[PDB]
Amino acid sequence: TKLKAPAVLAYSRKINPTNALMFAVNWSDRDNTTAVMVGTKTVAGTQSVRGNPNDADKGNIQTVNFANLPHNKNTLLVKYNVKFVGDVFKAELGGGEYSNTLQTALENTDFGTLAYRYVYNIAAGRTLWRNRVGAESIETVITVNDQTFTFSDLLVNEFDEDVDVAEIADMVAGVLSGEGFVTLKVEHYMLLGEGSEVFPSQEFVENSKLSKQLFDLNGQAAMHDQKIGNAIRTIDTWYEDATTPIAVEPYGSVVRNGVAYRAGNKTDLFTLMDGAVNGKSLTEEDQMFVTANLIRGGVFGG
RNA sequence: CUUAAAGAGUCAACCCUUUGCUUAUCUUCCCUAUUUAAAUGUUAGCAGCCGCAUAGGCUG
């Protein structure tokens, strides 16, 4: 007993998405993909900072980025490849006095549901935060091992039953429970309207710097890989007072709301893995949450 | 009323010169920095035109 957790214990990320490159298409002209360019407009304004009152007279020529659709294409296309990898129970930096006990404590994990919610967050449009808002038509095409799947009307908040997501979830759960990998090429086509302004992900700017950096690969608007990884693991409906699916965190913590849902109420990942290697009976939902964290990965040492 | 009581140490100056610390050196092998992640905080305070207004209203 009293199997104390290793200080070096970490797990690798098992859902690896690429950067979500963003293109402009039409709804019936889906093959002509023109890359959405981040424009950048200059704004003239004096600097106002707390530490330098002497520098407020002149300076701060700032040039803020923006990204709209072109005025001939009404559909935004978002392309990214989500790579699910198996052996989520292998610790990369941990070892096997604790990670092997985790293997033999989370073998009864229903990966079917875990994978369903992953592919449902892929398909329903959780990966399209501010640009699925106000779109009159949502479409998702998933290409997986030469199989094409079409999704039109999936409400993203609840994980309802559709056999299309389920079909992919099968091979995704077979990867995650076993050994190997699977790759889902996900292209989202959302009809926002003619010249509607799109929403790339944001680089962190300083309190000063410029107003807003949109995410650029080679000049073209895109969204962060870790931001999509936040979308995919947004499956946590099993904490106490669970209203909406949150991103599976080791503490159940969302930064933008200023509260942590699983911290400080004995449902955090660390107490559940210590309970697993000390062998108390877990329910299915918290064990699924622990396996979702191990799929997410991260260093758990102290 | 304290070995109480009391007291001017003054002055002057050439340290000189000289010098060979040289000699030769194998630092050297060895090797996992690894795994995560929403930037949120309304993230913008505009473009015309109605006017004498840098007063006050309207338009999207």
XYZ file of C-alpha atoms (C1' of nucleotides) in Angstrom:
362
model
C 0.000 0.000 0.000
C 0.745 3.771 0.223
C 2.130 3.745 -3.329
C 3.493 7.276 -3.511
C 3.491 8.964 -6.911
C 6.789 9.530 -8.755
C 8.046 13.087 -9.004
C 9.031 12.689 -12.674
C 5.702 11.089 -13.689
C 4.427 12.437 -17.010
C 2.328 11.264 -19.934
C 2.571 12.150 -23.601
C -0.180 13.827 -25.576
C -2.180 11.174 -27.425
C -4.575 13.400 -29.403
C -2.211 15.376 -31.641
C -3.994 17.807 -33.977
C -2.254 19.898 -36.583
C -2.693 23.640 -36.968
C -6.128 24.358 -38.404
C -5.407 26.068 -41.714
C -8.210 28.290 -42.938
C -9.356 28.708 -46.542
C -12.150 30.427 -48.454
C -14.536 28.322 -50.545
C -18.111 28.491 -51.770
C -20.860 26.142 -50.681
C -21.258 24.479 -54.096
C -17.687 25.166 -55.311
C -15.921 23.259 -52.560
C -12.761 22.396 -54.527
C -11.558 25.960 -55.218
C -9.737 26.634 -51.945
C -8.242 30.116 -51.670
C -6.221 30.783 -48.531
C -7.677 33.299 -46.085
C -5.119 36.097 -45.753
C -4.657 37.974 -42.497
C -4.863 41.626 -43.374
C -3.415 44.203 -41.013
C -4.626 47.796 -40.619
C -2.614 50.567 -38.977
C -4.110 52.579 -36.111
C -2.685 55.917 -34.942
C -2.738 56.496 -31.189
C -0.577 57.722 -28.320
C 0.795 55.313 -25.725
C -0.739 55.240 -22.238
C 1.262 53.125 -19.777
C 1.480 53.099 -15.993
C 5.273 52.961 -15.723
C 6.200 55.664 -18.256
C 4.215 58.913 -17.941
C 7.025 60.787 -19.726
C 6.631 58.742 -22.936
C 2.910 59.447 -23.460
C 3.516 62.480 -25.708
C 4.525 60.660 -28.907
C 4.859 57.084 -30.141
C 3.067 53.726 -30.347
C 2.384 53.354 -34.059
C 0.439 50.091 -33.819
C -0.758 47.901 -36.683
C -3.515 45.470 -35.669
C -4.289 42.297 -37.646
C -7.690 41.104 -38.857
C -9.034 38.251 -40.974
C -12.213 38.347 -43.057
C -13.510 36.185 -45.842
C -13.022 37.602 -49.349
C -16.017 39.287 -50.961
C -16.545 36.485 -53.509
C -16.486 33.445 -51.180
C -19.102 32.839 -48.499
C -17.829 29.619 -46.885
C -14.932 29.241 -44.466
C -13.066 25.935 -44.691
C -10.978 24.716 -41.748
C -8.544 21.856 -42.391
C -6.646 19.956 -39.706
C -5.506 16.387 -39.106
C -6.275 14.919 -35.683
C -3.980 12.017 -34.827
C -5.217 9.684 -32.076
C -2.407 7.475 -30.726
C -2.647 4.336 -28.561
C -0.942 3.058 -25.377
C -2.154 6.026 -23.448
C -1.105 4.222 -20.360
C 2.548 4.375 -21.153
C 4.305 7.016 -19.207
C 7.057 8.654 -21.091
C 8.912 10.067 -18.155
C 7.260 8.226 -15.388
C 8.189 4.644 -15.175
C 6.283 1.562 -14.245
C 5.762 1.150 -10.523
C 2.890 3.522 -10.741
C 2.134 3.622 -14.447
C 1.862 -0.155 -14.598
C -0.596 -0.048 -11.730
C -2.511 2.560 -13.716
C -2.521 0.226 -16.682
C -4.018 -2.486 -14.516
C -6.559 -0.140 -12.926
C -7.808 1.555 -16.055
C -8.096 -1.511 -18.249
C -11.844 -1.561 -17.616
C -12.168 1.885 -19.161
C -14.918 2.043 -21.747
C -12.915 3.678 -24.490
C -15.990 3.608 -26.704
C -17.585 6.543 -24.911
C -14.279 8.380 -24.564
C -13.690 8.113 -28.293
C -17.282 8.964 -29.122
C -17.016 12.248 -27.283
C -13.646 12.951 -28.954
C -15.016 12.382 -32.467
C -18.201 14.261 -31.529
C -16.137 17.273 -30.458
C -14.281 16.847 -33.748
C -17.426 16.692 -35.874
C -20.078 18.846 -34.178
C -17.927 21.974 -34.286
C -16.339 22.435 -30.868
C -13.109 23.200 -32.775
C -14.758 26.242 -34.442
C -15.395 28.503 -31.410
C -16.229 31.969 -32.693
C -16.716 31.181 -36.393
C -19.458 28.613 -35.949
C -21.383 31.428 -34.263
C -23.881 32.925 -36.666
C -23.299 30.388 -39.446
C -26.482 29.352 -41.234
C -24.960 26.026 -42.269
C -22.378 23.811 -40.556
C -20.703 20.878 -42.312
C -17.913 18.511 -41.283
C -16.127 16.042 -43.561
C -13.930 13.449 -41.848
C -11.559 11.388 -43.987
C -10.272 8.344 -42.096
C -8.462 5.287 -43.623
C -10.092 6.011 -47.011
C -13.592 6.541 -45.564
C -15.523 9.800 -45.877
C -18.030 10.922 -43.251
C -20.494 13.796 -43.567
C -22.028 15.714 -40.656
C -24.556 18.534 -40.993
C -26.675 19.053 -37.853
C -24.996 17.996 -34.611
C -25.664 20.100 -31.535
C -22.282 20.425 -29.884
C -23.320 20.699 -26.217
C -24.895 17.267 -25.769
C -23.349 14.135 -27.229
C -26.377 12.723 -29.054
C -26.505 9.487 -31.023
C -25.527 9.436 -34.665
C -24.136 6.342 -36.371
C -21.629 8.342 -38.391
C -19.615 9.608 -35.407
C -20.066 6.154 -33.865
C -18.523 4.485 -36.921
C -15.315 6.461 -36.547
C -15.408 6.180 -32.760
C -15.040 2.410 -33.192
C -11.622 2.588 -34.841
C -10.630 5.475 -32.543
C -11.461 3.428 -29.424
C -9.662 0.430 -30.919
C -6.582 2.601 -31.298
C -6.861 4.189 -27.845
C -7.500 0.919 -26.001
C -4.784 -0.929 -27.910
C -1.640 -0.081 -29.875
C -1.235 2.083 -32.962
C -2.646 5.305 -34.356
C -5.447 6.682 -36.503
C -5.621 9.944 -38.454
C -8.787 11.944 -39.122
C -8.462 14.629 -41.781
C -11.172 17.050 -40.650
C -12.418 19.750 -42.993
C -15.134 22.054 -41.665
C -17.183 24.055 -44.135
C -19.275 26.747 -42.465
C -21.416 29.120 -44.528
C -21.107 32.385 -42.629
C -21.991 34.737 -45.480
C -20.373 36.911 -48.099
C -17.267 38.531 -46.653
C -18.020 37.575 -43.052
C -15.148 38.150 -40.648
C -13.465 34.952 -39.479
C -11.754 34.115 -36.190
C -8.213 32.714 -36.115
C -6.554 31.855 -32.825
C -4.662 34.540 -30.933
C -0.976 34.759 -30.083
C -0.250 36.062 -26.605
C 0.686 39.730 -26.773
C 2.022 41.733 -23.843
C 0.007 44.221 -21.806
C 1.347 46.636 -24.381
C 2.721 45.356 -27.708
C -0.091 45.439 -30.255
C -3.809 44.844 -29.879
C -4.189 41.367 -31.361
C -2.073 38.824 -33.245
C -3.940 36.278 -35.322
C -2.258 32.935 -35.867
C -0.284 32.787 -39.126
C 1.318 29.858 -40.841
C 3.241 31.262 -43.893
C 0.939 34.289 -44.066
C -2.335 32.364 -43.974
C -4.794 32.534 -41.071
C -4.846 29.443 -38.876
C -5.694 28.258 -35.374
C -3.448 26.752 -32.715
C -2.847 23.020 -32.421
C -3.187 23.090 -28.628
C -6.395 25.093 -29.019
C -7.895 22.304 -31.139
C -6.516 19.883 -28.534
C -8.533 21.840 -25.981
C -11.578 21.316 -28.210
C -11.157 17.560 -28.628
C -10.822 16.715 -24.931
C -13.755 19.008 -24.000
C -15.678 15.912 -22.885
C -15.741 16.348 -19.096
C -19.374 16.036 -18.008
C -18.565 13.915 -14.945
C -17.464 16.388 -12.276
C -19.914 17.354 -9.536
C -22.308 20.083 -10.720
C -21.567 19.286 -14.364
C -23.587 21.599 -16.612
C -21.530 21.801 -19.823
C -18.591 19.724 -21.104
C -15.332 21.333 -20.030
C -11.829 20.526 -21.213
C -10.406 17.549 -19.348
C -7.802 19.119 -17.060
C -5.954 17.518 -14.140
C -7.825 19.988 -11.901
C -10.937 20.466 -14.049
C -9.914 24.097 -14.357
C -11.011 26.643 -16.942
C -8.958 29.823 -17.007
C -11.506 32.075 -18.748
C -14.218 31.512 -16.116
C -12.020 32.101 -13.071
C -13.091 28.883 -11.338
C -11.840 25.299 -11.141
C -14.511 22.601 -11.089
C -12.541 19.603 -9.892
C -10.011 21.248 -7.716
C -10.493 21.098 -4.038
C -13.285 18.587 -3.987
C -11.563 15.216 -4.158
C -12.256 14.602 -7.818
C -9.036 15.918 -9.137
C -7.008 13.590 -11.215
C -4.206 13.131 -8.724
C -6.419 11.816 -5.901
C -8.110 9.482 -8.379
C -4.827 8.010 -9.664
C -3.570 7.568 -6.094
C -6.882 5.847 -5.369
C -6.368 3.658 -8.432
C -2.853 2.557 -7.457
C -4.047 2.041 -3.894
C -6.931 0.115 -5.406
C -10.173 1.588 -4.126
C -13.202 1.076 -6.346
C -13.554 3.783 -8.989
C -16.758 4.430 -10.868
C -16.802 4.399 -14.656
C -16.969 8.175 -15.141
C -13.995 9.251 -13.007
C -11.901 6.374 -14.374
C -12.855 7.591 -17.858
C -11.769 11.086 -16.760
C -8.398 9.730 -15.567
C -7.895 7.890 -18.863
C -8.835 11.096 -20.697
C -6.144 12.943 -18.724
C -3.590 10.248 -19.559
C -4.623 10.665 -23.193
C -4.132 14.420 -22.721
C -0.928 13.833 -20.782
C 1.138 16.179 -18.675
C 3.566 15.927 -15.797
C 1.989 14.767 -12.525
C 4.726 14.938 -9.910
C 5.030 16.149 -6.336
C 39.611 67.168 47.927
C 42.489 61.716 43.763
C 51.832 60.197 45.149
C 46.433 66.364 45.720
C 48.997 71.120 44.512
C 52.925 72.731 39.327
C 55.575 72.868 34.883
C 56.799 74.882 26.455
C 61.198 69.768 24.525
C 62.546 72.362 20.998
C 65.843 72.405 16.455
C 68.284 70.091 12.051
C 68.464 66.838 7.850
C 70.220 63.858 -0.010
C 69.467 56.296 1.416
C 72.084 55.374 -2.185
C 73.368 52.833 -6.547
C 73.733 48.186 -9.620
C 70.856 44.330 -11.653
C 68.888 38.140 -17.733
C 63.841 33.824 -13.777
C 64.866 31.415 -17.100
C 63.787 26.234 -18.740
C 59.774 21.551 -20.959
C 54.893 20.283 -20.435
C 48.527 15.369 -24.254
C 43.200 17.446 -19.549
C 40.241 13.439 -21.330
C 37.265 10.515 -21.645
C 31.045 9.324 -20.931
C 26.070 11.025 -22.094
C 17.960 11.018 -23.746
C 15.898 17.203 -20.824
C 11.905 15.181 -21.336
C 5.187 15.287 -21.517
C 1.289 18.948 -21.418
C -1.337 23.563 -22.565
C -8.202 28.174 -24.878
C -4.887 33.817 -23.694
C -9.026 35.229 -21.613
C -10.492 39.836 -19.552
C -16.985 42.678 -24.587
C -10.353 43.530 -26.881
C -12.973 47.710 -29.627
C -14.118 52.429 -28.731
C -15.159 53.300 -35.633
C -16.642 55.207 -40.917
C -20.817 59.956 -42.713
C -24.162 63.594 -41.959
C -27.516 66.871 -39.237
C -25.631 70.908 -37.683
C -21.765 77.527 -35.649
C -19.567 74.112 -31.954
C -14.097 70.345 -30.758
C -22.533 71.435 -27.412
C -26.107 67.988 -28.646
C -28.509 64.159 -31.982
C -28.943 60.554 -36.228
C -27.091 56.533 -39.652
C -24.812 51.023 -39.710
